[PDB]
Amino acid sequence: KNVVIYADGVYDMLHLGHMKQLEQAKKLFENTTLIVGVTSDNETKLFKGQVVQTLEERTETLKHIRWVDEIISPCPWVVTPEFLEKYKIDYVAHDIYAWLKRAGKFKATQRTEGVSTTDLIVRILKNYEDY
Amino acid sequence: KNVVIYADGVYDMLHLGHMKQLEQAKKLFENTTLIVGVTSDNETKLFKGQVVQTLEERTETLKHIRWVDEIISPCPWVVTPEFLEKYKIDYVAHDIYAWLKRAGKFKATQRTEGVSTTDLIVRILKNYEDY
Ligand SMILES: NCCc1ccc(O)cc1
Numbered sequence A, B: 001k002n003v004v005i006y007a008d009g010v011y012d013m014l015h016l017g018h019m020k021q022l023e024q025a026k027k028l029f030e031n032t033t034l035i036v037g038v039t040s041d042n043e044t045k046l047f048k049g050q051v052v053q054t055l056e057e058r059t060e061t062l063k064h065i066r067w068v069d070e071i072i073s074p075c076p077w078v079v080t081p082e083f084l085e086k087y088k089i090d091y092v093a094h095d096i097y098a099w100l101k102r103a104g105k106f107k108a109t110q111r112t113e114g115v116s117t118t119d120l121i122v123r124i125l126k127n128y129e130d131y
């Protein structure tokens, strides 16, 4: 009855939006094991953009999140069908993944806007009137 | 065999230092229930200092932390012996609490410096040379 779920990401400056996404993946089925993949520093900076925390730091933080059962750190930057077979993964949860949908292994999850870490720094700054 | 542990705090902009502290409280004994108290907005600002996230936001974030079994939100600003009796609390874990030590109900925990949220914003800013 136990369904292996895989989610990946940078998880830089972990905030409530990441946590809500992890929870939703974990609760896709009644009985799950959620594996979370954490992207490497060199590959993230080359392909996506700047990251402030190292792989070690980003991974140590995810360890404290209730919904996380396993962590692959670093994870591969591209999910392959060999990867799914090797870790006996039943679904990938993300927010091209055409082949994942074709195989029935795709489960969508939602981003929550406005809860980010950068948003909080903006809130602190609003305390200082421009004039 | 199950030991009720109580920890309280502001938990504004939750970071790895808070998480490590919660873990340490949770692992004080083999078999624990960790209750976490979250201080109110009005009382924190009057007595400690400024807080950026509301009570609701600070509490919703703690809900995702693996070590947290129960949350009292808002918690009282001062722990009283009536409070310990009402929630059948065996130890309070903090980092005056003289009466707690006299009763054998005090367990110390450690702050981890340098992992804070404000520290990360400083790191982002170091990317911009003064000149
Ligand atoms: N969430 C950031 C985008 C991304 C996700 C997963 C991955 O393997 C590579 C990039």
Ligand SMILES: NCCc1ccc(O)cc1
Pocket: B008, B009, B010, B039, B048, B076, B077, B078, B079
């Ligand atoms: N960690 C901030 C200091 C504080 C802790 C607990 C409490 O009930 C009131 C203030």
